[PDB]
């Protein structure tokens, strides 16, 4: 009743507003045919909200959606008599016990991630659940979710979970978040086939045996692990994004079987040759920094690239990088490049990292007027070229790699004094014009 809504309004002193389909950040209500309250949102209503609103809440028996997200509540005992709910938002609160969440026979969506929960037994009788958010908690075991069928989106990530076997009993899921945990065996994740997004981030996984069974995946996050063989991923070609960050891998030939992949982070590994990345013409982002690779020539056939991270690698010749034109970021610092001539055609560049190399002449990078980041620290540069002061940037002598900045550090600057070059771009220009005069 609108009388109940007004009662809640003056009790909280907050202007609840007649609104539409409820969201986790909603602070109003939703009506019905004959003006019956069904959905109510209390976003950031204080820590004492639940114990003060339950009498008005139980007064109306038509409520089916409750948003108490980010209210920082500690006790949810009042959430027991409102047996007419369907969706419940309880994000980002100091909730430890979910025992009152037992009588809510009907619930289709439960959001609980930002909490301090440790025991998920009480939600064993919640039959018709379809969405569960339980990330960033202190849980260590998941037995009670086995009885929970009809789940499509599950987020159990950020806990101390080691066994995952009961997830086998759950076969309806679409997105599975299982990360920042202590997991070693993924054998249960075999009978799943409807899964599209899998986030198996930081864990002690080294044998991706059952993922071959999955076929509809489009996003695969597998980073900060101890994996070494990616041949299992060779069969699957449907992933728009597959991230393989810090690991110990030496071969990437199985990746060459993929063709629709878009963004590829391949960082901090022992990969030797990147030739298998010669047929992925649709790559928009490539992150290959911190590896032992020598030749960039096989990468001269990916003209759709837009971001390229090649830093801290053993590349000396940059010439077979002139073919690419639609490039915007180029990080290849901490390498052994010498001349930067075969980059003058990279008209679309907007950020560069050319530091910690053996580069003496900077003059070729002159036509690249689009650069909004250039970083040449720790290089043996002797003379500063005219075009170095023709860029829309300010100059810093700091050790930080900042965008919108021309940066030098630890450089034997002889003709331009280091004090002059650390004064600023205007000082560099006046010094050079005086030298001209």
């Amino acid at each position, epitope marked *: 009743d609108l009388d109940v809504i007004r009662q809640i309004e003056q009790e909280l002193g907050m202007q609840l507003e007649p609104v539409d389909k409820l969201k986790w*950040y909603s602070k109003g209500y939703k009506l019905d045919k004959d003006q019956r309250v069904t959905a109510i949102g209390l976003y950031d209503c204080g820590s004492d909200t639940l114990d003060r609103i339950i009498q008005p809440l139980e007064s109306l028996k038509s409520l089916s959606e409750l948003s108490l997200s980010s209210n920082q509540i500690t006790d949810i005992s009042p959430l027991a008599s409102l047996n007419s709910l369907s969706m419940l938002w309880l*994000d980002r609160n100091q909730i430890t016990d979910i025992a009152p969440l037992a009588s809510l026979n009907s619930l289709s969506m439960l959001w609980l991630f930002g909490n301090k929960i440790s025991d998920i037994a009480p939600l064993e009788s919640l039959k018709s659940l379809t969405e569960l958010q339980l990330s960033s908690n202190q849980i260590t075991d998941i037995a009670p979710l086995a009885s929970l069928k009809s789940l499509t989106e599950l*987020s159990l990530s950020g806990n101390n979970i080691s066994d995952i076997a009961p997830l086998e009993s759950l076969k309806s899921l679409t997105e599975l978040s299982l990360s920042s945990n202590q997991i070693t065996d993924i054998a249960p994740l075999a009978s799943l086939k409807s899964l599209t997004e899998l*986030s198996l981030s930081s864990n002690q996984i080294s044998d991706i045996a059952p993922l071959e069974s999955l076929k509809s995946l489009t996003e695969l996050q597998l980073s900060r692990n101890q994996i070494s063989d990616i041949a299992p991923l060779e069969s699957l070609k449907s992933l728009t994004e597959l991230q393989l960050s810090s690991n110990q891998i030496t071969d990437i030939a199985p990746l060459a079987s993929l063709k629709s992949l878009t963004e590829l982070q391949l960082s901090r590994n022992q990969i030797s040759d990147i030739a298998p990345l010669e047929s992925l013409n649709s790559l928009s982002k490539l992150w290959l920094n911190g590896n032992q690779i020598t030749d960039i020539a096989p990468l001269a056939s990916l003209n759709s690239l837009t971001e390229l991270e090649l830093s801290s690698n053993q590349i000396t010749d940059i010439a077979p990088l002139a073919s690419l034109k639609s490039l915007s970021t180029l990080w290849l610092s901490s390498n052994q490049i010498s001349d930067i001539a075969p980059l003058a055609s990279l008209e679309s560049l907007s950020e560069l990292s050319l530091s910690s190399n053996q580069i003496s002449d900077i003059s070729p990078l002159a036509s690249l007027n689009s650069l909004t980041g250039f970083d040449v620290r720790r290089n043996p540069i002797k003379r500063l070229p005219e075009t170095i002061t023709g860029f829309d940037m300010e100059i*810093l002598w700091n050790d*930080f790699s900042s*965008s*919108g900045f021309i940066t030098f550090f630890d450089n034997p600057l002889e003709s331009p004094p280091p004090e002059i070059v650390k004064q600023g771009k205007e000082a560099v220009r006046q010094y050079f014009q005086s030298i001209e005069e």
Partner: nanobody
Amino acid sequence: QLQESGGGLVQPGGSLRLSCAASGKLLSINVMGWYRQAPGKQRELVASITTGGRINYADSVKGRFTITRDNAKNTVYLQMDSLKPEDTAVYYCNADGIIAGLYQNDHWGQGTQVTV
């Protein structure tokens, strides 16, 4: 990830507008704001804003820096005016939210140098 645009060398009393855009991967942003690192110091909050419209200021840049946010396109803007030379720092972006189903209250940007 959070991408920051801005920064540079500004005369004292000048102004700046640091922009911070969160990628489409970051899903449910509650708190988003700005932090600083001075040389030989520690990280300290500058500004924080929430989806509901609550602003938290550092009590040292009160009435000086302004935080604005767009929730549709998840973007924060720090409009900074009358920059005293104690602000010569590297500014970082802080956010809370979800990437690929995982929630952390502290997602950081790369940082951008502001000098006076």
